[PDB]
Design a binder for this molecule. Structure first.
Ligand SMILES: [Zn+2]
Ligand SMILES: [Zn+2]
Lengths: 147, 87, 138, 195, 134, 134, 114
């Protein structure tokens, strides 16, 4: 498709207890990072790297409709595996997933959203570097990756 | 697992809170593990040797005990604290 | 002059208690915060909780100026402490402990798409193009 | 103890810095958690190794992995990591000396044991992740010999290359003289033998 | 006029303050001896192209701490306070950042070991019981 | 090998080195300096684009080695664009003598006078780099 | 190539043309903000990506004990005889066999390829 192939490869987050994986920018929006700079600063640490910037362009464009944290949480909550019958229940549900269910090893305290954004930004950064070929793909057979 | 994981799990579990209206709280506090002991039919405990466990088809198990503290509140700004040692 | 080799040593004082608790308010370089234009400002606890464990809202010149939200630093300093040293005429530094740290981010002010309008215009996402048009419709 | 120590060594907390500093600094991960960044990873890694080798604040099973080409330092303290002891080599020389061997010979009535080697910093456990960064000499008799000059930066040496074998494979004589499928069959037969 | 109004004198007068990072034990001793007001002295030395910061703890309180300065250009930090009378104020802007470190290294690890041992006391571990509970 | 070249599926993505979307509303003043030397040849006597043309322009660079290895030249490529898109795209290209093969694309005057005037050049570009077969 | 953000909301700026004056303008969506564009190029992609790996290589690799070292390639910037050499390590390079060299002397991050 002309529009599809014009936007190309774009990033989605497969979160726990969520029926359909959200555009990754929505997770940053839901974490409270509203402006594109706040989000990209956590994804791209060196803005002078245009390749990384062009790779994130479609993700920003897909999220554009969601410009508010509460809207992202309502979107995440309306995509919740148990949809909330009202927006307030949906937002609290989405917050609970992002608070305890997503990335629990990074933290579970109500003020750990900043640390979660950095690690989520790093997950995106790793995916971008892999897609750009700057880092090789991880090996499942590598026993350093085993426990 | 025994020295740390067992105690961490017991301490990691949230204290039980119960409401009628009197309020009750149960807090686990310390784990103690006795030497592997076998209880005879008459109920006499006896140290179990592994040879005996293999011979008599026993399970080589250690009795596990935990200190539990029960606090009750009866909406009268007063709380009664009782501790069940080595439960 | 002496400034090329000046050496200064001052006594350190740490008051046991102070009528005002000391907190750190940090802004990002991209915020370009300027206090000269802050003819008026408000710092108050948020309303989303519906207090000491809740975010702060910073507003400048009432509704006319910029809005910021302060969020408490989650990472505790179990092996660290922060103190603010201030200059004093008597030749002694007075140190105040950092009771709390809040990171502030600016909040954009414009016709933000509501939850309903997003729930509506999500329908665009299957075929969205020329996003400028969505703002013209709104 | 690692996280507390890192605060001593100025590791900057993610919540106390601007993202612009992340480009030049190295990311510090502990058990997969991004703790912060550090501007002098070389001095930090040398300090971490020294503390581990001294068993001051870091236990021997903690593995420190520095991805030099990726500005990443990963410290793993979790369980289940497979690791093995390797002799430490510095300045192309073994830290193990005749004094240690003599003390190990005099193991009885002397209480000198393996733990004293670890405490002496002569040998350390290297896990599968850290092995990637390790330049391992197969034997001191020939691999670290200046005459070979194959590599001048060996960091560790194998204690004995035969220790790669398991229990049943260690019963095979001259396994290096047998075809590999035959060493596999013996490893099964050794479990089916009688004795 | 409102409860949330901030006294911006720190910003208006451009009052500059230094944010210094110091160990818990050091600041703990200062807090204990806080009533003395003689916890130590802060010495600053500047040269043609180098400057250093250091602190010396009072002998009675102990019974040299070089400080490393850090850039403040990467993030704008400000200090604000809330008065018990419900009056907020901005004390100033952070103009310098520094961090305290010990001068010695080998004996300093002894203190860390003591702190680790003291920190292990609350770490409860399963107790082996010699006799079964009857 | 000639038969192989006719058999092997070749798309512009195989022969193009790089491509860029430039904004130059007046073709008589190309934003690309080097284009002016050759673009003036075409815009000396403009045709079908005298009245109007898309202010946006897509510039493609083709790798001479891939082009010559596949025995592909700009002529049939320019025709194949118009064979694919029709007259929708005004396609103008430099001489073979140039160090780099350059073709200039604008949307037709009547569409300027289909989805959008600018961003659809990405649809055109990505389609040309994917579905368009040389 | 350069990315611009709105100075009001730090959102992405998109290229636009004013039909009134016909000039490229970076307009902020949802923010009615526009800024004077200067590069005049809104998009570019390098399909062959003949980018020099020396730009991506990090001087710190000189500290890697697993990398080979050679005394036959002295550093041009400082004359240090020992240098560290390795291959591209980039997956996009379908032909990555050339050697990239980095000076072994501390603080001398000079990099070159033979
Ligand atoms: Zn804007
Ligand atoms: Zn050099």
């Amino acid at each position: 498709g002309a529009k599809k192939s014009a936007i190309g490869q774009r990033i989605v987050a497969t979160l726990p207890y969520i029926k359909q994986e959200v555009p990754i920018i929505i997770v940053f929006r839901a974490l409270g990072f509203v402006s594109d700079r706040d989000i990209l600063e956590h994804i791209i640490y060196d803005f002078e790297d245009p390749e990384m910037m062009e790779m994130v362009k479609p993700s920003l464009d897909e999220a554009f409709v969601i410009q508010e944290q509460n809207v992202a949480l309502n979107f995440i909550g309306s995509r919740g595996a148990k949809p909330g019958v009202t927006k307030e229940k949906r937002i609290k549900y989405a917050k609970e997933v992002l608070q305890k269910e997503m990335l629990p090893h990074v933290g579970v305290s109500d003020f750990c959203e900043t640390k979660k954004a950095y690690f989520l930004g790093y997950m995106v950064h790793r995916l971008l570097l892999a897609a750009l070929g700057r880092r090789e793909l991880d090996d499942r057979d590598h026993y350093g990756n085993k426990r | 697992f025994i020295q740390m994981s067992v105690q961490r799990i017991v301490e990691d579990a949230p204290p039980i809170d119960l409401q009628a209206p009197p309020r009750y709280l149960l807090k686990f506090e310390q784990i103690y593990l006795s030497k592997p002991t076998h209880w005879e039919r008459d109920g006499a405990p006896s140290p179990m040797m592994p040879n005996e466990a293999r011979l008599r088809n026993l399970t080589y198990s250690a009795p596990l005990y935990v200190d539990i503290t029960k606090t009750v509140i009866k909406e009268g700004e007063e709380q009664l604290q009782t501790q069940h040692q080595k439960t | 002059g002496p400034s090329s080799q000046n050496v200064t040593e001052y006594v350190v004082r740490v008051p046991k208690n102070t009528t005002k608790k000391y907190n750190i308010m940090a802004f990002n370089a991209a915020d370009k915060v300027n206090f000269a234009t802050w003819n008026q400002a408000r710092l108050e606890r948020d309303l989303s909780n519906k207090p000491e464990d809740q975010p702060w809202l910073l507003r400048v010149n009432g509704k006319s100026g910029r809005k910021f939200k302060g969020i408490k630093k989650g990472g505790v300093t179990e092996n660290t402490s922060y103190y603010i040293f201030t200059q004093c005429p008597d030749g002694a530094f007075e140190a105040f402990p950092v009771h709390n740290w809040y990171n502030f981010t600016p909040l954009a002010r414009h016709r933000t798409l509501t939850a309903e309008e997003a729930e509506e215009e999500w329908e665009r996402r299957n075929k969205v193009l020329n996003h400028f048009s969505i703002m013209q419709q709104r | 103890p690692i996280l507390e120590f890192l605060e001593e060594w100025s590791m900057e907390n993610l919540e106390e810095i601007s993202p612009a500093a992340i480009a030049d600094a190295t990311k510090i991960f502990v058990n997969g958690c991004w703790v912060g960044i550090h501007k002098d990873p070389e001095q930090l890694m040398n300090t971490l190794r020294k503390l581990r080798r001294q068993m001051d604040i870091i236990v021997s099973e903690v593995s420190m992995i520095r991805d030099i080409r990726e500005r990443e330092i990963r410290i793993y303290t979790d369980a289940g990591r497979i690791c093995r002891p390797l002799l430490i080599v510095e300045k192309q020389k073994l830290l193990l000396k005749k004094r240690h061997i003599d003390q190990l010979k005099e193991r009885e009535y002397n209480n000198y044991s393996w733990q004293d080697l670890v405490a002496s910093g002569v040998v350390e456990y290297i896990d599968t992740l850290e092995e990637e960064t390790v330049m391992l000499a197969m034997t001191p008799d020939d691999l670290q010999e200046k005459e070979v000059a194959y590599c001048s930066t060996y960091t560790h040496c194998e204690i004995h290359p035969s220790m790669i074998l398991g229990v049943c494979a260690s019963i095979i004589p001259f396994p290096d003289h047998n075809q590999s499928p035959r060493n596999t069959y013996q490893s099964a037969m050794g479990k089916q033998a009688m004795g | 006029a409102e409860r949330g109004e901030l006294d911006l004198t720190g910003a208006k007068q451009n009052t500059g303050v230094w944010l210094v990072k110091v160990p818990k034990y050091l600041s703990q001793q200062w807090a204990k001896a806080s009533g003395r007001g003689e916890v130590g002295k802060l010495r600053i030395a500047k040269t043609q192209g180098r400057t250093e910061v250091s602190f010396t703890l009072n002998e009675d309180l102990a019974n040299e701490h070089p400080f490393v300065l850090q850039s403040v250009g990467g993030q704008t930090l400000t200090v604000f306070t809330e008065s018990s009378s419900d009056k907020l104020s901005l004390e100033g802007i952070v103009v310098q950042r520094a961090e305290c470190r010990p001068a010695a290294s080998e004996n300093y690890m002894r203190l860390k070991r003591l702190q680790i041992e003291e920190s292990s006391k609350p770490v409860r571990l399963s107790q082996q019981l010699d006799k079964v509970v009857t | 090998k000639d038969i192989l070249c006719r058999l092997e599926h070749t798309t512009l993505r195989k022969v193009t080195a790089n491509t860029a979307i430039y904004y130059d509303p007046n073709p008589q003043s190309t934003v690309v300096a080097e284009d002016q030397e050759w673009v003036n040849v075409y815009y000396e006597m403009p045709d079908f684009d005298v009245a109007r043309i898309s202010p946006w322009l897509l510039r493609v660079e083709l790798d001479r080695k891939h082009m010559t290895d596949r025995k592909l030249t700009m002529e049939q490529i320019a025709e194949k664009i118009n064979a694919g898109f029709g007259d929708d795209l005004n396609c103008i290209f430099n001489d073979d003598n140039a160090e780099k093969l350059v073709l200039r694309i604008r949307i037709m005057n009547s569409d300027e006078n289909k989805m959008d005037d600018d961003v659809f050049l990405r649809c055109i570009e990505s389609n040309m780099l994917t579905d368009m077969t040389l | 190539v350069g990315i611009r953000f709105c100075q009001e909301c730090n959102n992405m700026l998109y290229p636009k043309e004013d039909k009134e004056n016909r000039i490229l303008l970076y307009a902020c969506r949802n923010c009615d903000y526009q800024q004077e564009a200067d590069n005049s190029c809104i998009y570019v992609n390098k399909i062959t990506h003949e980018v020099d790996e020396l730009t991506q290589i990090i001087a710190d690799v000189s500290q890697d004990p697993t990398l080979p070292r050679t005394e036959d390639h002295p550093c041009q910037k400082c004359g240090h005889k020992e240098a560290v050499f390795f291959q591209s390590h980039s997956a996009r390079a379908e032909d990555a066999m050339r050697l990239y060299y980095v000076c072994t002397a501390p603080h001398c991050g000079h990099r070159w390829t033979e």
